[PDB]
Amino acid sequence: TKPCWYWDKKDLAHTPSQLEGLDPATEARYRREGARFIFDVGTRLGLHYDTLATGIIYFHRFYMFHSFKQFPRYVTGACCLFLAGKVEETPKKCKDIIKTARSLLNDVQFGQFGDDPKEEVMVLERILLQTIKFDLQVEHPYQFLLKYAKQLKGDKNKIQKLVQMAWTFVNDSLCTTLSLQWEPEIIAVAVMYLAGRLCKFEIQEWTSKPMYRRWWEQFVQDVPVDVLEDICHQILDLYSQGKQQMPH
Amino acid sequence: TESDWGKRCVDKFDIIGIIGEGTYGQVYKAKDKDTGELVALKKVRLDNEKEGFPITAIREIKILRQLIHRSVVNMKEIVTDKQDALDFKKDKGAFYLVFEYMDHDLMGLLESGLVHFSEDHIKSFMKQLMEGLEYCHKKNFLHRDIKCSNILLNNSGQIKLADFGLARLYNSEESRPYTNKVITLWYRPPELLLGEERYTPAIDVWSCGCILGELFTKKPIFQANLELAQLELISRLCGSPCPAVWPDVIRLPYFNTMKPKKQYRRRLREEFSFIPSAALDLLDHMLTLDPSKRCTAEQTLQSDFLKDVELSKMAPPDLPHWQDC
Amino acid sequence: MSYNYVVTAQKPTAVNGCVTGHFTSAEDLNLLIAKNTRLEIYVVTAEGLRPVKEVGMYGKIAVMELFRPKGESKDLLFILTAKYNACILEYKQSGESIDIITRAHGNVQDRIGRPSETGIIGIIDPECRMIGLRLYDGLFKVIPLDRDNKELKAFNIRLEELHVIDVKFLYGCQAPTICFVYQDPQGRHVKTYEVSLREKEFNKGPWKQENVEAEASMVIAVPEPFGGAIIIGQESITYHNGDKYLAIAPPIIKQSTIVCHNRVDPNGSRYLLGDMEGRLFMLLLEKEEQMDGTVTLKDLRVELLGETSIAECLTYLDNGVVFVGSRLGDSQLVKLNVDSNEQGSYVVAMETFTNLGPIVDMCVVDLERQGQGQLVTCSGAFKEGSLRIIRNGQKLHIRTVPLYESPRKICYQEVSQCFGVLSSRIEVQDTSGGTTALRPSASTQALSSSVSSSKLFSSSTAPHETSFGEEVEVHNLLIIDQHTFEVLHAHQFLQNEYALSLVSCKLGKDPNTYFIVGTAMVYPEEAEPKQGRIVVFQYSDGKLQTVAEKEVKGAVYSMVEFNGKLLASINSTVRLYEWTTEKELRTECNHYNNIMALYLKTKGDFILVGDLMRSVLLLAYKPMEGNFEEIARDFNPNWMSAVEILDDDNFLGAENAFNLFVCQKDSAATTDEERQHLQEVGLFHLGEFVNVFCHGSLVMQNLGETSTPTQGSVLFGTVNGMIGLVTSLSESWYNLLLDMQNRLNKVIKSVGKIEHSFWRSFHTERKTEPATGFIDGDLIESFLDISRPKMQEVVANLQYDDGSGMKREATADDLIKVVEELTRIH
C-alpha cells in the first residue's frame, strides 16, 4: 500500500555509510552539510519552504539506502532539490541549481560534480526515484505547526512567539535524522512543547480543554512525553554543540 | 513488498497492443503474467532528458497514489524496462505506470454513435463522475483537463477519471498564479477564455456540464477552433459575459478585448427544452457564466437529478455488439 | 500527403422516394423518382414514362414533396438534403433548353438538437401555408411559405412528445393541424395539434387522443369528404376523426409488415398498401351518405391484389399503371386489372427497371479470358436476392441471376469453373415444430444438396424456445456454374449457424482447392456470439465434401488466404492457421488488441484490420519469429463498413457515416511513436455506404497501356447500388485537378445552390472537416458537359506544374482531351 519511512535511532548504527567505516559523527556532519546545502541553494533560488524540506527528506531517506563514500552528498542534494522542485510545483532548471551550487561551494567541494555537473545530477534522478520507491508526496511539520496553532486562543503575541520559535526548531530539525524517526505531526508537537518550556508558557490554557495538562493529546493521539523529550533533547543538543544559544 | 515501486520489471507483462498515444509516451494494453489481470501501461521516457523525468508524469504519480476512489483510475505500480545496463549513466530504460485497464472511453463510444444512452444511464454516469470529482475537489486538487477522451468506462458500467497530467492543488486562502489555458477548447470554461489565471475548481464543473449536455445530444455543445469563436458560441447559449450576471467580469484581461457579436440573452433552457426537467436544471446550474455562482460538485450530487440515483443497481452501458456487423 | 481520385462507374439505382404531380407543366403528370443524390423527372404516358430531365444534387435527398401555392400555375418542388440543405425548385423550359430554378434555399441545421430515431420527416400543409420538418426529438420546425422567405428562415415549436413515429398535416381543418403517432412509456398514441404562424406555438388540436397499436408505423391523412386520419400497424388499421373510430384487423396483414402507402382516388376512397414480402393490397373506404347529406366513413376493407417487388415507395400514376419503387429489388411498372387472372392475381408486370440493390459483396473475374474482367455482385435481399453480372460495352451490360433468397458472400474458384456463394433464406416456425420456407429459392432448388452433420455444438444443455410464426434464417453455401449460373449444389449449415465469411484457395502443400466458410452460432439471447466454425469443403464431381472443421469460440467475421496459411478474425481475436499434412487447421499465432475484427485485407506479410469502432490497424506477420507485430494504428474513432489496401503505405477505409478516408504510415520514423501512428491524409464524403472494396477494373484492356495519369484500380459497391472506383494520382496531377475543381465550382450552377465544398466535407454528427486528398472525379468529368463560354472561363490563368514545362498555360481544348482520357478508366 504505502512504504514505511521510519527507523529506530538504534538502527542508524547500521546505515551503509556506517558499515563502510564512516563513524557516527562524520555521517551526522555529512547529513547536516548536505541538508544545509539543499536549504542554502534553494533559498538563494527563492524556493518555498516545503520545496526545501521535500528535497531534504529525499536526501535523508537516500542515505538510508546508500553510502556517503559512493554517492557524493552535494551531488545528491542538488538532485534531491531538483526533483523536489517538480514534486512541489516550484520547478527549477537543472543548470540554474548548478550555477547556484557553484556560487556557494568552493572548488574542492564542486569537484564532486566532476567534469560535467549537470550530467552527474540528472543521471542520479533514476537512482533517486527508485530509492524513494516513487513515494513523492511528503508532509512536513510546518503544516501541523500552523493547523494546531490556529486552534490556540489567547494572547496574540505569546502564541506568535511560540509559533516563530517552533518554526525555527523545525528548520533546525531538517539537519537531523528526526525526519527519519518521527512522523511530522509529532515533530510539530515536539517543537511546540519545546518552545513552551523555553518561553515558560502553559499551552493547555490556550486549548479548548484548559484543564487537560497533556495538551498535545488532542492534536496527536498516543504520543508519550518520552518521545517529545527525546526529540527536544536532540534539537537542543544541536544548539549545545554549536555556539548559537536557544533562540528565545 | 507491494510498496517497493520502480524495481519490478516490465517482463512481468505480456504486451497486447497500443491502446493510445500519451504526452510522455505511448500507452499499451498488457496482461500480467502472474495474475492474468489486464492492465494499461504508460511509457515514461526520460531519455530525452531535456528536463529529466516529465513533470506531467510526476503529477500523475503524486496525485493518483494519494487519491483512491471508485471513480478515479487506480495506478497499481511502476515498473522499469530492464536492469541490464548495470551503470546508471548507461541506463536509459523507460519507466511504465501501471493502471487498471478500461474497456472503452466516452468519446469513442459517442463518436462511433453505436451507443444510445438512456436517462437512467446518464444518471448512473454523471453521479459517478461528480462523486469522483467531489473526492478530488474535497482533497483540494483540480483536474484542469476534463474531456470525453479522459472519461473511461468499462463494460460493467463503472466510470473512472484518468488523465491527471495537468492536475494541481488549489488554495482558496492563498491566491496563486496559474496557467492561462488548461482545458481543451471545447470544454474550456469562459473565465479561462478571458484569462482568469486564478481559477477556482468550478472550471471542472463547466466541463462536466458540457459533457452532460453532450450525453443528451450525442454532439459536443461548443465546438470551435479559436478562443473567440468559442466565447461566441457559449454567449449564444449562456448569454454574453457582462457585469449584470458576472460582477467581476470587468477584472479579466480580455473582457474588453473579447466581446461577442452581441450582448446575447440566455437561451439555454430554450435550446435544451427536450431534456428532462431534473436534468435541465442541473445543466443550467453547471453552465453558469460566473464561476462564483456556478454550482459545486457536491451541489450537483444533492440535486433532484442525481440525489436519488442508487448506484447499487447500475444500468450497464448498451455497447451493442451484434447486427452492427 | 496522399493523392487519390474517386469516380462513379454506375449511378445509384435504388429508388429512395417517388412523388407524382404537375411539376414540368401545369398540364403534364410527372413522376419524380429520387435515387441517392439523383432526381429523375418523367412524364406519364399511356404506355409508360417519358424521361425529360435528370439532375444531380450535392446532397442525399431526404425529403421530396410537390406543392402548388396560390398564384403559381404549376407545382413547385421542395427538397431537403440529409445535411439539412433546404431549397424550393422550379422547372423552366425555353424551347429545347431545360433548366432547374433555385427559387429559395438555406440550411436549417440547429446548433443544438438530438437527431430523431425515425429520421427526418417533411410534410407540407394542404393550403401550402408552411413546411413542417421533424429533425430533432422534442422539436417541430416550421418554414412558413411566404413570398418573402427566399432564405427559408424558420422557427422551432417546443414539442412535449419527444419520441414521434410519424406526422402528417390533416385535411379539412379550420387551422393548419398536425396528426402524429408518438411513443412514451405507456404505449403509442395518436394526437393532434394546431400550428399558429402568428403566435409561433401549438394550440389544442381538433380532436382527443386515442391509444393506438404498439407498433403503429404510418399516418395517412385522408382528404374530404372524409377528413381525419388512418393509422397503419402490424396487425390493425384504424380510422380516427373526432368522435368517429373504426378498426379492421384482417389476419392477412399480420403476416408481413406494411411499409408504404399511396392514395389511388383523390377523394380518399381507395389506398394502396405494400408489405415486406412484396404483397400489394387495396385499402377501401366504404362511404355512407346520411339523411343530412353528410358523407361519413362506414367501414374499411382490405383486399389482396398481388405481388410486386419489395417496395420502398408506391405511386399510382394513371389508369392501372402503378410504379413500384424498390430499394431492395428491381423497380417496376405494373398494371392493376379489374378482373383477376387464372392464378387469382390482379397485378401484371409491365416493365422492370434494373436496380443493383444492396451490393453485399462482389468479385471481379475474367470469365471469357478477355483481359477485361466482369463484376459479379451479390445484390438484393429476400425474394429479390440475385447475382448480377456486369461488363462494359456506351453503357454497362448487366445479366440478372435470380436467387429469391438473400446473398451474403461471393468468391470465385477457377479450378472448378464455378462460384461459391453464401446465402440465407427466411423460414417460419410452423406447427410441426420445424420451419417452412415462404417460397422456393436457390438453396432449395439446387441440383444436389447436403446438410452439415457436425457434432461440435451438439452438447446442447441450452434452452432455445420457439414460438409458432417467428422467423429464422437458414444459411447455405451455393455452388453456381460460371457459364449457366445453375445452382449445382447447396449445402445447408447448422440450425442457428450464420455463414459470415468465404474464401476459395489452396493451403500449405495440399494441391486441392477448397471452399472455406467461417460461421457463427447465433442465439437471440446472446448479445455477442460465443461459438463458431471454420469449415473446409471440397467441391469435386458435383458433390461438396466436408474436409475438415475447426471449432472457434466466437464469430468468424472475416477470413483471407495468407501465403498458404489461413488468416481469420474470431470476435476480438485475429488468428493465423496453418494447414497440416493431416488436413487439419493448426493455430500458429494470435493478436488480441481489437474490439471486433470485422474486416481483413492483406498484402505480402502485412495485414490491415478494420474494427467496429477503433478504425484501422496495420499488422505484420514476422516469419523469423512466427507471430504478429503491430506496425501502426489509426487513433481517430471511426465505425468501419469496408477497408482496402491501396499500396504498401496507403490504406483506404469507409465509414458508416457515408465517408471515405485514407491513412498512411508516417514513413519518417524519428521516434517509434511516429511510426506507430497512422495519419489520416485523405477525407471525402462519398454519400454512399460502401460494403465491399475490390481490386480490379471493368475496362477492356488487353496488351494495351495508355499510361493513364491514374494509377491503380479499386472498385466498390454501395447499399444504393452505386458502383465507384478509387485510383491514385501523382502530386502534379492532383494539384492540376484540384485547382480545376475550385475553378469549376465557381462556374457550375448547383441545384439548390449547394456549395460543392460543403457537400464533400467529411461529416459525422460530431466532426465536420473539409475534404482533403481526393479529387471528385464526377466534378472533373462534368467539364466536358459545360458550355464553351464556361470552359474558357475555367481555363483562364490556369498553370501546370512539375511537367516537361514547369509553368504551362491551359486552353479549353487541352483540358477536353485530358478529361476524355480520365473518362476511359471506367
Ligand SMILES: C[C@H](C(=O)Nc1nc2ccccc2[nH]1)N1Cc2ccccc2C1=O
Ligand atoms: C479504451 C481503451 C484504452 O485505451 N483504455 C485505457 N484504460 C486506461 C487506464 C489507465 C490509463 C490509460 C488507459 N487507457 N482503448 C482505446 C483504444 C483506441 C484504439 C485502439 C485500442 C484502444 C483501447 O483498447
